[PDB]
RNA sequence: CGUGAUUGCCCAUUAUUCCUUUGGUGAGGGCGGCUAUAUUUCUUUGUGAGAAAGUGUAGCCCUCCCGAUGUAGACGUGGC
RNA sequence: CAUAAGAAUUGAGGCACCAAGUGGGCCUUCUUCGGUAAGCGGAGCAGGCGAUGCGGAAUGAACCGCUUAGGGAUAUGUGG
RNA sequence: ACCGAUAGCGAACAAGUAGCGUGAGCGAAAGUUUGAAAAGUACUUUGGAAAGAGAGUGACAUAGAACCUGAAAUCGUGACAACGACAAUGGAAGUACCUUCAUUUCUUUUUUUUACGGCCAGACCCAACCUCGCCGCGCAAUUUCGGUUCAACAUCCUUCACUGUGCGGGUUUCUCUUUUGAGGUCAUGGGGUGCGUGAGUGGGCGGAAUAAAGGGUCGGUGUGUUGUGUGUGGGUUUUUUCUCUCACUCUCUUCCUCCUUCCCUGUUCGUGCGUCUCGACGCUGGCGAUGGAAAUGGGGUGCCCCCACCCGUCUUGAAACACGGACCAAGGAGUCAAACAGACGCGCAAGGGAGGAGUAUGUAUGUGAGAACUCUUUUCUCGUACUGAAAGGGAGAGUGUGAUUUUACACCCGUGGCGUGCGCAAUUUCUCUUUUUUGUGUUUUUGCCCAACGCCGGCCGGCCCCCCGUGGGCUGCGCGCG
């Protein structure tokens, strides 16, 4: 998923480390995801995405229209964060070649897991 | 790795191949269900709903408990509108308090004869609800009576730690004095 | 899939075309970058 | 063998099945019972005002049938 | 298993505590209320009436009732799968206001006043920054670190 | 020099993806007395051939979607 | 409902009817009691097992990984 | 609207027999030739004899008196071209053998294999992800002793090392300066095909851009400058003088030793060019295999690889060294049924249910139908107010109203919270309609529930010193628009 940071967010996040992987995507990426698994949630039924017309139908409501805006809106935010967020179906990506190992904990800590930061891009590729 | 469901394969609840043996209704049914959905009509849709309960689930009404409604169209407008649809999905009652009531139109699955006649017979109009809503599709200035529910006597029978605060009437054996009532009326036996 | 892509990025098709700037292009820059390093570089001294 | 007693495990678990509630605790309105009985008093008496308050109920409708009818 | 008294005693919890001894002052009795009140209860000691079980020093509740000396609160207990209201005859002696709420409507109301000024009053006026950044650095001496072992023989156990 | 030989891998019912299945408080639709919708497919960069070509299409059919191990125990059958 | 400054969620919520099947558990990280002890006894928390298999630990109820429609294609898991 | 010979009575049978037990008593087992019948196999012939083999009968003796059928377990046989480290049957998999099924078929038909828009995925090939900055490099320099040689000296430098000079040419920015960009790399697929109505294959010529250039223009920044000024704090400064500048900070300086915006002056790159494009869809073909026999596809056995613990059950845990379980037939265990709670269909609805009965007239056996049809006056019965032990009372304490509401009047919603709804306005299009959408209104608590009176019986009888009235005031399976 995407996350809008503040300290709390900050927060429930830092607790949940040895279980999850997160960092700080990249707008190659960002797109890049926006391709692979792109889909939004329509009323629910979960629907890889096509057309700007839709994301607006969904989204001209805040006077987005298209993925650029999206990624926009995801590197650049808007506080439509949220809301573009919510209404995404949520990211399912892949096996990576490239395993985690040391039987898991964090990056220095383990395995790999915490936060990749910049890193995770570098992950998240061979993931997507 | 599935996750919490909020309960799993969303329960019979409020229903589908559905109820009752009456075969008009499958009609009905089918007439309406297009109306509500496609021929948008919140109100259709609702009758169409409506329709589809089981005999509890429409548990009847009666009038007098409708000359409020038409005491309703008296508050309302002055009156551009002068016109007004009751929808019954049971059977009409006749009450009993009034009697002397005006006339009007009700639309209902059923008037009892006597009702029936005596509406009518007051200038009433009993229609049944092919003989409204053909006539009558979409709404606006028409009433759902939404039945009542309550005043079964069942309910009577849900509590017994008799409790201050639960005063409530068993399904038990006296129906005269004792007979498993022998304090509570008194305060003291087996206490309260 | 450049129509789904260049739904969501019709310039797309034209950097496609042209490379967003090929070789030539891309082996310019660094040259003028490292003169002009080398200016800049070069005010400071001095009026150290 | 010895013959164990009782325990709490599992429980959280058994009620967070069915969840913990309250119940739209202020109902919308109070649960009833008790008080002070001269607060209790009093408040009956601007509850009092309750027919009046039922014939500022019909104040409206007959406000909209003497405007006129038509 | 247990005993069990209704005012079933512990170490160090009810005992009147750290020069805290002795009666309830008088600007404790001269407080006031009203009812609905969030108000959060605490045990003196000095009368053990009107003195709850032991659920309910720390918890908030709201009140609902204001009798002669005391004061009814409403307290949601967890029972199984639930909180269940109870409501509990202190005299007010056991009983304080919060500051829970205070706050967020104190704000609420004062942040209104301020929106409303901001409008719609006469006049506006700055408050705050956003969060937190980045910036230009101009330091201008920097340090490092050496740790242990240099100068020992000064220092350490023995 | 500046990397680069160049490509470190092997292998679960997990995962992806894909199909078929199945259920679902699931989504669509077509649901007309010739405009249309399924079946079968050409001539095969911008075709439904209403007329190229056979066949089906009365409230269901035709597309869509999420989910889909489960003892005890329960319920269901346009189940046997 | 801005900050000028500090959530996220919310594949519904509300709300209810009524009947079962169960009451010997056992295993575990963690805390902890009895006693030298004990694969011992005895509690506390969470999780399991039980009541699930699949994949891993030459061997294992509970360890690792992971849970399961039926498949297909792919890649991983633990583990090599 | 029963059972079907282990059923069904005990007993279909010379059965309550036989049998059994001292006796009391206990008390079984046990069914069918003939399309028609004994026509019940003469005769021959072997064979002691049985018998056999013949014959002979009869549709049928796979019907010969064991008679309908003739199930399974168990076994001989035939037949086997079936197999064996040794668990045994077992999974899974494929082959072999197969008795194998079903399907389709060529001188314009099938079949295995090549091949194929756009696709519809996956892998190769080169470009780059920038950059401030060291790093260094060079020079010199100090310190700095090492290889040469037999060693010393040369060769203070092999060099590590330092220090200074000087330089900006030169690796870092790793599968972190993107995890960037397309070029065909043509190998891989686990194929592939069908809306349509049609503006339109609209578009696609700029667009991009390191940058060189040019500054300029304003703008962002480190500094020297403080140009300050502000901050004043310390000293044997009460104060004043004097000393330390420390802390900050203003413009300033535009100091920049410094960015950047713009705008010019380059380059690039592609589309341009031209407007045609076009980027919104391959059962086919080529390979070889009957011409009525086959062949593609399906069944069976064996065999090999791998995989893989007796069921049931009780338990915490059963593959155990827990129990039960040699085999096959036929048996063999959740029933009827009151009041009653829910659910659901089902009837009618304040009534409903008769109900007991009884009558009742032909269909015609009968008849003037528990069961047919009913059919029903009387009603009966339960239901359509409850409350009190009682004695006993008892609900629009309507609403409203007057009301000093004993009363008396009027007579189409008790009080509030919610309400699918209905209304209004804004809101989109639509002529108008439609009317999307917006914005609100409003309305019985029988639509649900809540929340509060109110109400019946009830209880205390209040208020008060006691008691009564304005009026109370505790309580209940009650009542609140059938």
Same mark, same amino acid.
Not at chain 1, 118 to 128: D, E, H, Q, S
Not at chain 2, 106 to 133: H, W, Y
């Given at each position: ?16 480390? =040895?279980?999850?992987? *997160? ?26 995405? @096509? ?7 969904? *989204? ?22 949220? @809301?573009? @967020?919510?209404?995404?179906? =949520?990211?399912?990506?892949?096996? =990576? ?20 930061? @910049? ?10 | ?24 209704? /499958? ?9 509500? /959905? ?40 002055? /009156? ?113 | ?48 | ?19 913990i509630k309250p119940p739209?605790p202020l109902?919308?309105?109070?649960s ?39 | ?5 209704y005012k079933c005693?512990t170490?160090?919890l009810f ?18 209320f009203?009812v609905g009140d969030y108000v959060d209860v605490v045990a003196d000691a000095?009368?053990?009436?009107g003195m709850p079980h032991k659920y309910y020093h720390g918890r908030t509740g709201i009140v609902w009732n204001?009798?002669?000396?005391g004061v009814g609160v409403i307290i949601n207990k967890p029972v199984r799968?639930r909180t269940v209201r109870k409501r509990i005859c202190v005299r007010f002696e056991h009983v304080r206001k919060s500051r829970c709420q205070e706050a967020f ?54």
């Amino acid at each position: 998923v995407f996350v809008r940071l503040n300290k709390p967010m900050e927060n429930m996040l830092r607790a949940v480390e =040895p279980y999850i992987a *997160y960092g700080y995507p990249s707008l190659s990426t960002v797109r890049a995801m926006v391709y692979k698994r792109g889909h939004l949630k329509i009323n629910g039924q979960r629907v890889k995405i @096509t057309d700007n017309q839709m994301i607006k139908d969904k *989204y001209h409501n805040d006077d987005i229209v298209c993925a650029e805006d999206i990624v926009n809106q995801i590197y650049a935010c808007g506080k439509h964060f949220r @809301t573009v @967020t919510n209404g995404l179906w =949520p990211f399912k990506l892949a096996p =990576p070649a490239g395993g985690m190992r040391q039987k898991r904990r964090h990056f220095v800590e383990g395995g790999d897991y915490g936060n990749r930061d @910049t890193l995770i891009n570098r992950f998240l590729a061979r993931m997507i | 790795g599935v996750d919490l469901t909020g309960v799993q394969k969303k329960k019979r609840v409020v229903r589908h191949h559905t109820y009752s043996t009456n075969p008009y209704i /499958k009609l009905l049914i089918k007439l309406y269900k297009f109306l509500g /959905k496609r021929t948008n009509s919140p109100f259709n849709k609702l009758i169409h709903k409506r329709l589809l309960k089981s005999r509890n689930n429409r548990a009847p009404i009666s009038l007098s408990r409708i000359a409020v409604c038409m005491r309703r169209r008296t508050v309302w407008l002055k /009156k551009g509108k002068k016109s007004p649809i009751a929808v019954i999905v049971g059977d009409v009652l006749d009450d009993v308090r009034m009697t002397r009531i005006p006339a009007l139109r009700i639309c209902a699955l059923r008037f009892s004869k006597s009702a029936r006649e005596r509406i009518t017979g007051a200038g009433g109009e009993c229609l049944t609800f092919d003989q409204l809503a053909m006539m009558a599709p979409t709404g606006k200035n028409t009433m759902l009576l939404r039945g009542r529910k309550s005043g079964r006597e069942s309910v009577k029978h849900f509590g017994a730690a008799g409790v201050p605060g639960s005063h409530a009437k068993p399904h038990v054996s006296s129906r005269g004095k004792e007979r498993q009532r022998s304090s509570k009326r008194r305060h003291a036996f087996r206490h309260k | 899939n450049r129509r789904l892509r260049l739904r969501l990025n019709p310039f797309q098709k034209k950097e496609k075309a042209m490379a967003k700037g090929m070789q030539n292009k891309k082996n310019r820059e660094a040259r003028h970058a490292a003169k002009v390093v080398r200016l800049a570089k070069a005010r400071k001294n001095v009026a150290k | 063998a010895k013959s164990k007693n009782h325990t709490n495990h599992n429980q959280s678990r058994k009620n967070h099945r069915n969840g913990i509630k309250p119940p739209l605790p202020l109902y919308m309105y109070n649960s009833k019972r008790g008080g002070w009985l001269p607060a209790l008093v009093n408040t009956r008496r601007v509850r009092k005002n309750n027919q009046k308050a039922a014939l500022k109920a019909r104040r409206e409708r007959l406000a909209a049938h003497q405007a006129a009818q038509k | 298993v247990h005993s069990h008294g209704y005012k079933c005693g512990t170490r160090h919890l009810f005992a009147k505590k750290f020069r805290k001894h002795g009666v309830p002052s008088v600007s404790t009795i001269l407080t006031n209320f009203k009812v609905g009140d969030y108000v959060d209860v605490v045990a003196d000691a000095a009368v053990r009436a009107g003195m709850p079980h032991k659920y309910y020093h720390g918890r908030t509740g709201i009140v609902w009732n204001v009798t002669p000396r005391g004061v009814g609160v409403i307290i949601n207990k967890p029972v199984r799968n639930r909180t269940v209201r109870k409501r509990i005859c202190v005299r007010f002696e056991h009983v304080r206001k919060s500051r829970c709420q205070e706050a967020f409507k104190q704000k609420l109301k004062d942040l209104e006043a301020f929106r409303a000024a901001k409008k719609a009053g006469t006049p506006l006026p700055p408050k705050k920054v956003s969060t937190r950044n980045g910036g230009f650095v101009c330091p201008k001496k920097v340090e490092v670190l050496a740790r242990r072992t240099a100068d020992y023989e000064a220092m350490i156990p023995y």
